[PDB]
Design a protein around this nucleic acid. Structure first.
Lengths: 134, 27, 197, 170, 190, 232
RNA sequence: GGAAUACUGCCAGCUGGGACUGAGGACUGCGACGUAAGUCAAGGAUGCUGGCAUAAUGGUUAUAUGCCGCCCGUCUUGAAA
RNA sequence: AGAACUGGCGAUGCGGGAUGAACCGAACGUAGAGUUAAGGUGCCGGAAUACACGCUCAUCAGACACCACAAAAGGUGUUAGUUCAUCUAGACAGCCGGACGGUGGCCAUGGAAGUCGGAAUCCGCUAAGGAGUGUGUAACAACUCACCGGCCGAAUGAACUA
RNA sequence: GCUUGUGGCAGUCAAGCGUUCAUAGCGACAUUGCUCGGCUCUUCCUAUCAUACCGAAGCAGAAUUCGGUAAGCGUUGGAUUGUUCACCCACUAAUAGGGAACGUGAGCUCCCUACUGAU
RNA sequence: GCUCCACACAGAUGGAUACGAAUAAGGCGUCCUUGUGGCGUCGCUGAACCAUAGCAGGCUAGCAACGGUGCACUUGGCGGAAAGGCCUUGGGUGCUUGCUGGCGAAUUGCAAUGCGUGGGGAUAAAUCAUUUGUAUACGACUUAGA
């Protein structure tokens, strides 16, 4: 029985949702509307507020998220289908976006709020080291 | 093996070959 | 940061690696390079094997013995490489390659202690995928180094005796990742999360 | 970086010759003044004039009509080299008239060593229907549902010392 | 020209079943098994229907596009080698001295002796690669048969049987002596 | 760079191309009105002196050949694409070899002639041959051991290299004579032939294959009727 | 049809962070703010506070490191010699 | 080589060009602070192991400097162009089939049938077949591509330019 | 960045470049015409004379010629010297060409240090 | 070295936080049909992880756990590549910020981090001097002698 292993990938395709690293948009989800060439795609995510633009694929990262979108789809039309797939709910459900939040939320701890964390992590340890050596 | 340093007598004995190519074209 | 940054050649590019290993001593940074032999380079093999011998010939006239000594053993191969970008000769220099150390294999006391790599210098991550790229090991040998094996063999050993290790650890964790899991979800925890942790 | 400049010139109106012919040409440049300077150079190649003999009537920028659309651009180019000058045509799949001529100029440098002083851009035109596309590397994206990967992804690190040993899936 | 997506197709018959993890390729079938490493080449295998395999190559250069077609062939030859087998027939000729070819089981490694060839006291001992079997051609005078699964094992060992019989510093036309591959074929002819 | 550079030729013949296709296109369309009856032939494989014998049989009726797709488009492919009425129906039926014939003569004189016409020809690929050809275990001859040896000449030593490679037969040569150790058999009665099985019997000059030319569809111009008959 | 928004340019727009400097030595001057009295960021730093006499601090010499440094004079020749 | 002119050094430090009479900047009181020139920013070395588009594999690449000499060409290395031509009336490649009739044309001659040669290179048939592109033979045969045609189903070939 | 292998003169040449472009005229490889030195001891170079392995030849064998990789290892002796500015048979596997400048002319007609070793 | 006297005193500041191999692939978890096996899941930076509150970290009162951890001991085992460390068993003794307490901090005044010598004694050995010659310019080398 034939097993060809692995070969999984994220793909540049019309209607792949992307997360942009470098740029004014940054950390905001848009989706590929039209592949220009090898390196350039045309994006947009009107739900976040990032505008419709030519963009190098080095500016951006593809996500494990995709939806049904026609070729060369306009802003209103993108939004509709984006709302149809309801990606944000799907998106924020991933351990991926949860990490991005967990980076952000930690970054805005007060000095006092950070102290609390230490104090709790003192308790949470005691309960944990109890459970072991049994 | 050959070198890739230009000795200065050559590096400036190129300029004085290039100058001779300038006056040759005009005439 | 860390006082000793045991690196690890295993898939780096003699150059680059170097450079950085270099700067880092110059800026007072005790390094230590391991698995030298699994260092790499650029280009076919039958090259480095040149861009070398040539190097070999070199040597001194009237008195061959006093001159450009051609070390074989990897480690050193790569040394040079590096003692070549550090004004070696001058207090501040010597004061460096003072700070260095390049073993082939990965003998104690380093076996037992985390290592690391230097992005900004891995074959995988710099060489246009699929391109000729040499791998010391051979390249040493090919020109003297008499041990490739010892290393090798008296290697496999290490790897073993370790992985073994591993396990025992992988086994351990699991338990934790399990305790924490369960005794996770009770208040206290919750709270944390809010803050994030 | 580039912008497109609509320029008109008319060789200052002499006695008995009121309001001459007016020469319209679209010039891609980086600024209004490079544009003007280029304009006269092209004037000296079309006919016998000089920069002092004429006048820049009107120089106005042109923006791209729909820069959220992807067009295909069939470009005519005259360019000089080591040899005598020679006409050319390439194709560019792009967003904007201007980003097109831009990306062409990089290619004209990369392949043929020719710099901005040498290149005349003859005419840039959108091609509306497919099959008028004569180049393979353009036709290559004009297939229904083009789904491909970008394997071997370099993740650029800021820190010199990485502990993970970087894997490049995507 | 920098292609975008270059793929071939590998047709798999009903007997054999392919296994490909990383770039290591197993062909398990009627005659036995074949394994081959293809990491050196760097392509993408894709099972499509238990009956067709697509190797693709993205963003390829002409030299990387080439590397793709030769992979179809080198898996094809791994499949045909089990369902059909590879058999190479070698006939040997002479002028005066008849060549007295035999097989020795010395050290259990299996060698082929070449004796008396062009009047030689030098006995030319040739190794036999594993997988490949040797048998003498019955009812045909002075002929030997090399039959195995792999194309390498076979044809390389055929080559080592031929190259040992040069004529040193003599004429090509005048001296006919040696061993030559007469016929290239299959084990199961259909 | 790097491409197969074609064999440089200095032949006295030039490439026909489209100047020939146009000359055929008009010739079919001019012969449709002048003549009355049309036939389409499935002439499987045809020797040239056989074709000229069909030519020299009658000079009144015209034989038409060329490209199948030339013969579809000059006549007609569909109900819209047509020169004459119901002309597309005969073109859909002919799919094998291109053969076509215009005639002004009687229907019965044609079909009786072509059923009776069967000629001596070589064994052909993918077609069966009714012989069990065996070669003698000594010196081989030009006939291959069918006629007595005294009548026939021994085969040329120059052709034996080909006998080993394409014709496959295990051939050794002693004193300029082609010799096989065992009595070889190539073919049997009632078996489909391969290319090498065919060419062996072509080399020895054996005419053990019947050639009967067949005809299929039939048409009359003024009546516009399409007749289908399977002869052999 | 209706807004925007980039880009270019303006502000005698507002609000921060850092380094360097404090020349001069009664008052005159040009101003600003105030209804006036007066006050001020207006012809160049003032205010508060801390460190000491077994001081504070400052220097000398010997080396060390970084970086730089062809042997002085005369006489030629176009300078190096 | 000679003549004229205008600079540079000569009486001249300073940054740069790894190093230097002729090159690049910049003509100097002693300091602090800022900004730059020329040149650079993997490490030696102060400064992006910056971003962006391409190109290149070299058996001692390249970073060689009015692109000047060895340079006119060669290469089944590679990327792009330009100009001619075929292209679902089915091209390119490919196994398959035909590749003929006066005729085994005519002189040369033991022997010449396309194929050791000399001068013509005709005509008929057709879809197309050269009084012939090679292998081979004493001479023939058989094979051959060139020219068609069938089986397959799309872009391919030639001369060049960079 | 010096130099090495195929002469110069007239011409059927014949890709392109010549203000227009074969006739302002040049023009690549070809083909037509005439015709005061030389005896020791070190080192390196390959452009190899032998030895090593191949490739080609109507190369049967033996031997030969041409060519390729290779510098690992080898490369002789006698009569002539009015200015040595010539050569011949004797052997051997073969008796290759050169560089290291006034190479070893401070081996010929109580300045500094390389090196060999020693404490 | 042992013993007796006399003296002399290239840059730490929470933690180097242990698989191997691949990268046109991999971890990690689960079911086993034990496989190049399936299902699940992760990655897109260490921004993590583990430690982290007390006079530069004191002195005392309980509650709840039966754990965490420091220290000399003790049982057994591992590590030869440069092992020169890494684990474990048993008990003792501290500490516990897991929870709640009860006391002290000032005036430091508004910044200026807060293991060799020089003689003795006992005992191991080498050198010199002598002898031999396998060695030798001189050295050095080799021998022999309570």
């Amino acid at each position: 029985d034939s097993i060809v292993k692995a070969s999984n990938w994220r793909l540049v395709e019309v209607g792949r949702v992307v997360l942009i690293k470098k740029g004014q948009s940054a950390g905001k989800l848009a989706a590929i509307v039209e592949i220009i060439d090898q390196k350039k795609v045309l994006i947009d995510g009107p739900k976040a507020g990032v505008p419709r633009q030519a963009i190098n694929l080095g500016q951006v990262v593809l996500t494990p998220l995709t939806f049904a979108l026609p070729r060369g789809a306009r802003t209103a039309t993108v939004s509709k289908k984006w709302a149809a797939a309801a990606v944000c709910e799907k998106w924020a459900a991933s351990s991926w976006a949860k990490k991005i939040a967990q980076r952000e939320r930690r970054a805005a701890l007060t000095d006092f709020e950070r102290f609390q964390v230490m104090v709790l992590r003192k308790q949470k340890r005691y309960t944990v080291k109890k459970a072991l050596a049994k | 093996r050959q070198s890739r340093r230009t000795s200065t007598k050559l590096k400036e004995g190129i300029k004085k070959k290039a100058s001779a190519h300038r006056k040759k074209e005009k005439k | 940061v860390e006082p000793v940054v045991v690196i690890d050649g295993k898939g780096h590019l003699v150059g680059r690696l170097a450079s950085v290993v270099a700067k880092q001593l110059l800026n007072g940074q005790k390094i230590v390079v391991v698995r030298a032999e699994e260092l790499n380079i650029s280009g076919e093999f039958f090259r480095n094997k040149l861009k070398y011998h040539d190097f070999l010939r070199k040597a001194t006239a009237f008195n061959k013995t006093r001159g450009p000594f051609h070390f074989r053993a990897p480690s050193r191969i790569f040394y040079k490489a590096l003692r070549g970008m550090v004004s070696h000769k001058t207090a501040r220099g010597k004061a460096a390659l003072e700070r260095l150390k390049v073993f082939e294999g990965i003998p104690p006391p380093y076996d037992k202690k985390k290592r690391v790599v230097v992005p900004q210098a891995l074959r995988v991550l710099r060489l246009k995928p699929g391109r000729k790229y040499t791998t010391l090991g051979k390249l040493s040998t090919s020109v003297g180094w008499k041990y490739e094996d010892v290393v090798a063999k008296l290697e496999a050993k290490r790897k073993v005796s370790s992985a073994e290790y591993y396990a025992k650890k992988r086994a351990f964790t699991k338990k934790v990742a399990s305790a924490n899991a369960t005794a996770a979800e009770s208040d206290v925890a919750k709270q944390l999360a809010a803050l994030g942790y | 970086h580039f912008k497109e400049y609509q320029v008109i010139g008319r060789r200052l109106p002499t006695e008995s010759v009121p309001e001459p012919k007016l020469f319209r040409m679209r010039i891609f440049a980086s600024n209004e003044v490079i544009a003007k300077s280029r304009y006269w150079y092209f004037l000296q190649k079309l006919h016998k004039v000089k920069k002092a003999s004429g006048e820049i009537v009107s120089i106005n920028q042109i923006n791209e009509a729909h820069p959220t659309k992807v067009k295909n651009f069939g470009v005519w180019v005259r360019y000089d080299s080591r040899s005598g000058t020679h006409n050319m045509y390439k194709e560019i799949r792009d967003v904007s008239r201007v980003a097109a001529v831009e990306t062409l100029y990089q290619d004209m440098a990369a392949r043929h060593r020719a710099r901005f002083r040498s290149i005349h851009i003859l005419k840039v035109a959108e091609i509306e229907k497919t099959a008028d596309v004569k180049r393979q590397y353009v036709k290559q994206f004009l297939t229904k549902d083009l789904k491909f990967p970008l394997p071997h992804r370099v993740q650029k690190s800021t820190k010199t010392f990485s502990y993970k040993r970087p894997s490049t899936f995507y | 020209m920098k292609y975008i997506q270059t793929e071939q197709q590998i047709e798999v018959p009903e007997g054999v079943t392919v296994s490909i993890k990383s770039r290591i390729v197993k062909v398990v079938g009627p005659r036995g098994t074949l394994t081959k490493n293809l990491k050196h080449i760097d392509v993408t295998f894709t099972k499509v229907n238990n009956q067709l395999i697509k190797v693709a190559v993205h963003n390829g250069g002409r030299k990387h596009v080439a590397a793709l077609r030769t992979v179809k062939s080198l898996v094809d030859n791994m499949i045909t080698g089990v369902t059909k087998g590879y058999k190479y027939k070698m006939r040997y000729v002479y002028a005066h001295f008849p060549i007295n070819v035999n097989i020795v089981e010395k050290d259990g490694a299996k060698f082929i002796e070449v004796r008396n060839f062009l009047g030689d006291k030098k006995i030319r001992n040739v190794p036999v690669r594993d997988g490949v079997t040797i048998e003498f051609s019955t009812n045909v005078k002075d002929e030997i048969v090399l039959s195995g699964n792999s194309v390498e094992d076979v044809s390389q060992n055929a080559a080592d049987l031929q190259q040992i019989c040069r004529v040193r510093n003599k004429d090509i036309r005048k001296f006919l002596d040696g061993i030559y591959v007469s016929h290239k074929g299959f084990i199961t002819e259909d | 760079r790097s491409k197969r550079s074609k064999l440089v030729t200095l032949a006295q013949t030039d490439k026909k191309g489209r100047e020939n296709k146009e000359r055929i296109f008009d010739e079919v369309r001019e012969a449709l009105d002048t003549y009355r009856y049309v036939w389409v032939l499935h002439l499987d494989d045809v020797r040239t002196p056989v074709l000229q014998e069909i030519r020299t049989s009658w000079a009144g009726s015209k034989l038409i050949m060329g490209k199948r797709k030339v013969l579809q488009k000059a006549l007609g492919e569909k109900r819209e694409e047509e020169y004459k009425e119901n002309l597309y129906q005969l073109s859909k039926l002919c799919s094998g070899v291109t053969g076509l014939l215009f005639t002004d003569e009687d229907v019965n004189t044609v079909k009786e002639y072509f059923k009776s016409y069967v000629r001596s020809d070589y064994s052909r690929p993918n077609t069966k041959a009714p012989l069990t050809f065996t070669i003698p275990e000594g010196i081989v001859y030009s006939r291959g051991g069918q006629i007595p040896a005294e009548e026939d000449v021994p085969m040329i030593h120059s052709l034996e290299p080909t006998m080993r490679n394409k014709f496959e037969i295990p051939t050794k040569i002693k004193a300029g004579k082609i010799t096989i150790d065992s009595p070889y058999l190539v073919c049997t009665e009632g078996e489909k032939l391969d290319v090498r099985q065919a060419l062996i019997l072509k080399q020895f000059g054996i005419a053990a294959s019947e050639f009967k030319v067949k005809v299929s569809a039939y048409y009359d111009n003024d009546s516009s009727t399409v007749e289908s008959t399977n002869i052999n």
